[PDB]
């Protein structure tokens, strides 16, 4: 499987690096998409190479989507192409993993009304206003959508997402 | 004229300091309310003293409210007492100034349905989902609510807010 | 009303941003002059665009001068052209606002003998040795010269400077 | 199964956080041991709670050992008790995972003579002088010892370590 | 000989550490005096232990004085006791070494009128207004006063100061 | 006399700057060699110009060698040319000063068997495994090799090294 990550500068470092390596362990191919080629730097200073830009992503070529948190989702959600990628993959029923501020991209895509999930508690009212049935749990699984809240939930977040990709 | 500020650590420094001094120029008494007494530190490292805690605020004692941005509103909006202060003052028709992420507190208060305003563009979809008629302008004035987007709007933000307090 | 600012990297962020927006509120045109075009960054990391270089400034084209503090004045005062701009505008009786280390430029211009004002207390002995009658006050107004000491004085500093430009 | 981590301040953040969550996914109990109770902070600023001090560790109570990298191993290897824990667990054939500078603790334990493994390439000559058959590979498995070199190897490092704990 | 250093937080790190070790090489005893006991931290993050406070210094007990630069001299020069120590030792003809912003303390002591020396070029006009015959040289020796400008002058600064202490 | 320094980014700032100026005081020519031309930055942010690259160094042209510490030696010791320079100069009996992690380069050169010296205590076991008779002292002098442990030893380190160059 080809797993796409939508992110940008000021991503929450462990929320990108943890699923990146956890999914590589399974033999899945992992791709970082962002605004431009080169590198992006997390809140804590970890640097990662960008594999492709949002403009070059064909959503049909990717099988699963991961949305790390941090401050990057508020930048990503203003890019119409990045939001279109998330709208298409999520609405087609492809596996989507979000954590922390990651689901702000799904709010902007207009795909969460009636869906059950979680997020960083600081944006729960925004998830509720987007029609989410918000749950305070380390991991929520709602069909193709696997959601978690904070870095302390990483173990449970990918435990459930890896099951979805099997 | 007693102006209350609702804020916390990681406030956007100039969005707190600019209205604080602009309103002191007019002879208004300015008060910083936060989670605990002592000091709070902005994103850029400026420190300010907390005058009172959210639990000690009686909203009837304050005439106007300022909501600076940064990452502080996502912490403030999880405090039921801080949200109740903003709900009471805004719903009473008292002057309320918000900028950048500041209106996340008003979203949580449930007072923005059908109101017209702006915010940091990164949360415009959350403002729209809360019932705001969102406008991309340096300053919007909707009755008692004066809203702006980013630090570049400071001059226009307080130019309009000062007129409401006269 | 064209207001010129003489500054450089490591300016005290709020001492530049506060008067910039306060004077824009009045409808005055504000200009940042520095060593080179592009951007300059304050002590706390705020970035601002440089409008023109010291070499391109014709002091006859500007009506008032603002001298923010920080570590920038110690760099600015070594530039003969920047010091000549401050000498000409101050000695012509045009309104000049200084705060914190800002008057180090006026010391270098040789215009403060027998004038009354203030500064960051750490350089009061240097102001006294330049012939200033130094006062420990949040704001001092001596004809065209409006001086303040530290960021806590911002409200009083521009309250008096705005009156001079009216 | 109880997994012990030996670490200190300036640990490489992802080298501690990644195996911590990867092993919690399997249902293993994970324990952070360091010099004192309270918290320790990684090179990149992530902070983690210390579960117990080196003096309180009884090696017989733990089933497996993880040695993250960063600058922490050079501090840990000067603590005779921490080195004795690593010596006892490694020499008893319990699973031991090391990455980056992590095996400096095993060098100090005197247990690597005639063993095959890897490390951060910057200390390969020190591993060779301790009697290691050094291999430049993302992961090496030598009986109970699973070793990796850098953060890019995380996926392979725990892929092999998890197999040892099954 | 007992060499006293007058300094505080935000000292220029190499300007304190270099003379400290260079004078210890000669067998001189070296003492750091500051506002309070404990430690002080330089601009670049080096930490040094404070040996005694300004209040506990008896200038008669010290044979030579060193004044490092950085931002510390602007804090030190506001302390009447620290300025009195520098006034007494300098006016008694004891060896005094200054570099960079270090001579701001001697300006405040009122001992430089007619003396020949140098400093950080950014404060040369303040040295001139204090009556200094200012020279642009890596090191100036004027009787008991050895002065230098910047970190690049360290080699020449202590080359001359060590000769004075022989 | 020409003194060569082998170093890189993340050198311990005072361990490079202190011997650089101490040896310039004696009139010796000092040269910084690193991976590329331009500048290198220490752990604490001091920046120094690189005089020449490792590939351009002819060991016959230099009379003495300095090896500062920090994290730079673990990068330098992976460059076969930099290790060959240290090997050639040390094995020819030219004066060699090392401090802290600096002797990791000599370990990699294979020249320390049966030699007496010291280092940062965190790598003493690696020095012992390289055949060093390790001593816990502020300075050790073994023929041409002058070694010290930490920044607190600077005064003693160059006191002994300067005697070798006379
Ligand atoms: Tb940011
Ligand atoms: Tb934060
Ligand atoms: Tb600076
Ligand atoms: Tb460190
Ligand atoms: Tb052997
Ligand atoms: Tb400072
Ligand atoms: Tb590093
Ligand atoms: Tb042997």
Author numbering:
A (entry chain B), B (entry chain C), C (entry chain C), D (entry chain A), E (entry chain B), F (entry chain A): 1 to 166
From the publication, what sentences describe this entry?
In this context, we recently proposed a lanthanide-based molecule, named the crystallophore (Tb-Xo4). Tb-Xo4 is a cationic complex with nucleating and phasing properties. In particular, we show that Tb-Xo4 may provide different crystal forms of a single protein and correct the often-encountered defects in crystalline order that may result in low-resolution data as well as twinning. We prove that, beyond these crystallization properties, Tb-Xo4 is one of the most efficient phasing tools compatible with serial crystallography approaches.
We performed two SAD phasings by merging several data sets obtained through the MeshAndCollect approach using protease 1 and pb9. P. horikoshii protease 1 (PhP1) crystallization was performed in sodium malonate pH 5.5. Crystals with dimensions ranging from 10 × 10 × 10 µm to 30 × 30 × 30 µm were used. Data were collected on four different mesh loops corresponding to four different crystallization drops, leading to 81 sub-data sets. Among them 27 were selected and merged by HCA using ccCluster with a distance definition based on the correlation between intensities and with a coefficient linkage threshold value of 0.3 [Fig. 1(a)], resulting in statistics indicated in Table 1. Despite the soaking in the concentrated solution of Tb-Xo4, half of the crystals, coming from four different supports, were sufficiently isomorphous to allow the merging of their respective data sets. For both presented examples, even with soaking of the crystals in a solution containing 100 mM Tb-Xo4, the level of isomorphism between the crystals was sufficiently preserved and kept sufficiently high to derive useful phases.
